[PDB]
């Protein structure tokens, strides 16, 4: 298909089937970085992401849109033909739904033995009958993985937001698919990848869970955004706003304590010389440290705290609100937020390509396409005549 | 170096410099999937991850350990020699620290023009003097990207936990490095990748932020784990604990509303016939819906709710505590949590390899190595003699 040559993934052909966040995020990331990516949508039901007024202009940029019944008669034929020149196919569905519909990995590989197939589901491609075919949702994946129970406040768990598990799961699929693609270069044989959202999230939540698994205790939840184990780390309130800080290092602790009224604790058996990180539970003075830290910070502005903390080499930052990002000097200097044109000629604002590749940078070359916009071009590209396409459309098997 | 051949990344040589989570997580993921990965530590002190009693057994498995001063004299010479047979080099530092120390991308590419170099920093490799060279932390990246302000409760922001931004940033580095590796296989030209943690997290927080950038409003924070925008979605309290639910679908909404006492809202302007998903912002009876839903849930046990919701096909799950995972049938069937031996011969429990590659699965072949365990073997493998290695040790430039 016509598109500029750019990025590390120029020339790669990626196809995805899925809706909403997790699967499409995985597929579209290839498009950020130069791949030819085809978004498959159902003929009767467009991707529900399109209900949102602005997000999809970002989350579906740089894509080609195919609308095809990939499971029925000529529609299935056209889909399996497409696979013959596809490098990576990503699909998100409820367990082994593709196999139940007659599109097994084996059938995909009959059409392209080199194909890298990524299956993204809530609970995996196999397991028990009770869980395997259950719906995939971000909240459920967080609930089921131990991630949710570690988020929120001491007496109020909550999910990480927004839809954190969908992003982790999608990104993992992209990563895994690129890894499998590497192996195809050497062997000429494809791969199938079983990405279960709860397993992705299990891994992301191990920092303290590893203690529980190996004889120790699970950590508590944060109290008002303060770290559950490390004093002076996390979220604090100043006079005119919130900050985060990380009270780490020998001099940092000594100088900070001088400021807040706790110079007398330095050199004690509880906070001995050379202490570089305070554990709030193990240290009897943990609660006192927080009382004095809170009191000192509450009488100072963010600007004052940042100025002192810079003098003391204490890591910190203002908690930015969304309205403060666009004018922030680092954002401006790095063009972190940019603008592009939608397919219907309106200006859209949003994040630039990340990360920044030096030799082969990504770029935004196309706005989000409409439902079935590229169907005719795609089918022509894989050998369908104009009459064939008109016939697919008349049968209800494709939408142009 | 001696190791089993397995996984999609068998034969790939990866080296990383960094400590704690973000950089090492990026490097170690290659090792999960079969690569030869070398972990660089300093000489006279080790990676601070090692102070954790259990996590590092997971986060540093399948690794080789090199202890080498890569910036100074003959230590630098040995590092640049190692780069000649390295495919991917990952480093986490404060901005362009490697360049400041004398190791520019140009120097690296003099030794291997194919080298894929991933630079992971808080604020990027370039930008303003004020921000570019500031410390990299998870809390700071959340604060500076607008992620933190979107997490927590209505009147209490908080970070996503545990250390969510380090995991997103590290995972992105792995992904981007694999993409650049594809380009190397195609053109022979290496790459330098500027991964700024705040830009990673900017992207993960766009679902509602795109509305703010394009004329609309920002979304509020969750209330006690409930979605800020969609009614009947998120965390709820039953008689005997927490669940998550997703009130999505026509009959789901109708039958739930009848159960909870709101049948009179159906077929109205506020909840039109055929409503699939209630947008709370715009529905005048959103608070009433939450009131009635909470009252009904509070009189039923988690089991009673799951039973009814299974009848209605409403997606839901119990919020699992960490003690509930190991015996869960899906975890058992999929061997999601497994055991392996540490290098000193103890049994360690934790997550299996994820995701599950069908043809070339990952495996756990080695426990976390000790500080400088593989220094001698690595230096020997790239042409150093026993005497040359002893001289590095006496000079304080390597540890064995």
Curated annotation (Swiss-Prot), chains A, B:
CoA binds at residues 94, 101. Transmembrane segments: none annotated. GO terms for molecular function: L-carnitine CoA-transferase activity. Induction: By L-carnitine or crotonobetaine. It catalyses: crotonobetainyl-CoA + (R)-carnitine = crotonobetaine + (R)-carnitinyl-CoA; 4-(trimethylamino)butanoyl-CoA + (R)-carnitine = (R)-carnitinyl-CoA + 4-(trimethylamino)butanoate. GO terms for cellular component: cytoplasm. Keywords: Cytoplasm, Transferase. Gene3D superfamilies: Crotonobetainyl-coa:carnitine coa-transferase, domain 1, formyl-coa transferase, domain 3. Its main location: cytoplasm. It is found in: Cytoplasm. The keyword Cytoplasm applies. The keyword Membrane does not apply. Pfam families: CoA_transf_3. One of its GO terms (biological process) is carnitine catabolic process. This is L-carnitine CoA-transferase. It comes from Escherichia coli (strain K12). The gene is caiB.
């Amino acid at each position: 298909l016509p598109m500029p040559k750019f990025g590390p993934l120029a020339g790669l052909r990626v196809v995805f089937s899925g809706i909403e966040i997790a699967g499409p995020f995985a597929g579209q990331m290839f498009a950020e970085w130069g791949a030819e990516v085809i978004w498959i949508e159902n003929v009767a039901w467009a991707d529900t992401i399109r209900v949102q007024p602005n997000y999809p202009q970002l989350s579906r940029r740089n894509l080609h849109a195919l609308s095809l019944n990939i499971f029925k008669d000529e529609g299935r034929e056209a889909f399996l033909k497409l696979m013959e020149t596809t490098d990576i196919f990503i699909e998100a569905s409820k367990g082994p739904a593709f196999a139940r519909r007659g599109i097994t990995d084996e059938v995909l590989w009959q059409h392209n033995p080199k194909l890298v197939i990524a299956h993204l589901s809530g609970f995996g491609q196999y397991g028990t009958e009770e869980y395997t075919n259950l719906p995939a949702y971000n909240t459920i994946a967080q609930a089921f993985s131990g991630y949710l129970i570690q988020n929120g406040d001491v007496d109020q768990p909550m999910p990480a937001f927004p839809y954190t598990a969908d992003y982790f799961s999608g990104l993992t699929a992209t990563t895994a698919a690129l890894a499998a693609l590497h192996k195809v270069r050497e062997t000429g044989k494809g791969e199938s990848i079983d990405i279960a959202m709860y397993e992705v999230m299990l891994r992301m939540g191990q920092y303290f869970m590893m203690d529980y698994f190996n004889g120790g205790e699970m950590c508590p939840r944060m109290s008002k955004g303060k770290d559950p184990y490390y004093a002076g780390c996390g979220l604090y309130k100043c006079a005119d706003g919130y900050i985060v800080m990380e009270l780490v290092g020998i001099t940092q602790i000594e100088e900070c304590f001088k400021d807040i009224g706790l110079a007398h604790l330095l050199g004690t058996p509880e906070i001995p010389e050379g202490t570089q990180l305070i554990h709030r539970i193990e240290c009897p003075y943990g609660p006192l440290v927080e009382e004095k830290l809170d009191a000192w910070l509450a009488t100072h502005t963010i600007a004052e705290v940042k100025e002192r903390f810079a003098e003391l080499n204490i890591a910190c930052a203002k908690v930015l609100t969304v309205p403060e990002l666009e004018s922030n000097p680092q954002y401006v200097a790095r063009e972190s937020i940019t603008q592009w044109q939608t397919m219907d000629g309106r200006t859209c604002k949003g994040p630039n390509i990340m990360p920044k590749f030096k030799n082969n940078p990504g770029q935004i070359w196309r706005g989000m396409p409409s439902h079935g916009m590229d169907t005719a071009a795609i089918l022509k590209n894989i050998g369908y005549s104009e009459n064939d396409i008109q016939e697919l459309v008349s049968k209800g098997l494709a939408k142009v």
